[PDB]
Enzyme design. Structure first.
Site, PDB file in Angstrom:
ATOM      1  N   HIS A 185       0.815  -1.214   0.000  1.00 14.29           N
ATOM      2  CA  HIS A 185       0.000   0.000   0.000  1.00 14.29           C
ATOM      3  C   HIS A 185       0.853   1.271   0.000  1.00 14.29           C
ATOM      4  CE1 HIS A 185      -3.945  -1.382  -0.241  1.00 14.29           C
ATOM      5  NE2 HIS A 185      -4.033  -2.041   0.918  1.00 14.29           N
ATOM      6  N   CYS A 215       0.714   1.650  -6.233  1.00 14.55           N
ATOM      7  CA  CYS A 215      -0.247   2.612  -6.755  1.00 14.55           C
ATOM      8  C   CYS A 215       0.441   3.960  -6.988  1.00 14.55           C
ATOM      9  CB  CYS A 215      -1.382   2.774  -5.750  1.00 14.55           C
ATOM     10  SG  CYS A 215      -1.553   1.244  -4.793  1.00 14.55           S
TER      11      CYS A 215
END
Lengths: 4, 158
Positions: free
Chosen positions: B74, B135
């Site tokens: 993440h 991401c």
């Protein structure tokens, strides 16, 4: 293709 | 296209990260990248909680040291967060994987632009490779890049  | 993957979940604040009941006994390996001074334990469970450790196994049938290995981390795009400095990886950058029994040497080949629904990058290609999912940003939901690396050698921990 999981999270992130 | 018609159906969007649910892998776009927002990673909870850093409070839950350092306050979360860390499952150390569930760690099956570790990842290290001196180039970007990044180090995190590999969590077998691909749960939301496990993803807070920065690295979690994508596929259950993954075998460290053989086939295409993949881990998801993440990234909130904020320096100090997980997988944020991963995008700083350069071609030919050395990466080391530590299994409970050995260590494998991987070399970054580069980065590419792919969608979060692209499970193909994690599929076995009859070769030894590594795929990290990072991401671009918490504001950019259009597309995300994936970093790929190939196995260059193997060395047991003496």
């Amino acid at each position: 293709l999981p999270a992130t | 296209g018609s159906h969007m993957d649910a892998s776009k979940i927002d990673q909870p604040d850093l409070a839950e990260v350092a306050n979360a009941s860390l499952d150390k006994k569930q760690v099956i390996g570790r990842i290290s990248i001196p180039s970007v001074s990044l180090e995190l334990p590999v969590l077998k469970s691909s749960t939301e909680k496990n993803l807070l450790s920065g690295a979690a196994t994508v596929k259950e049938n993954q075998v460290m040291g053989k086939g295409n290995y993949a881990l998801a981390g993440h990234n909130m795009s904020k320096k100090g967060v997980l997988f944020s400095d991963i995008a700083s990886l350069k071609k030919g950058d050395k990466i080391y994987l530590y299994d409970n029994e050995n260590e494998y040497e991987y070399a970054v080949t580069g980065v590419s632009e792919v969608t979060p629904d692209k499970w193909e990058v994690v599929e076995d290609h009859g070769k030894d490779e590594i795929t990290l999912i990072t991401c671009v940003s918490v504001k950019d939901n259009s597309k995300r890049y994936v970093v790929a690396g190939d196995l260059v050698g193997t060395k047991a921990k003496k």
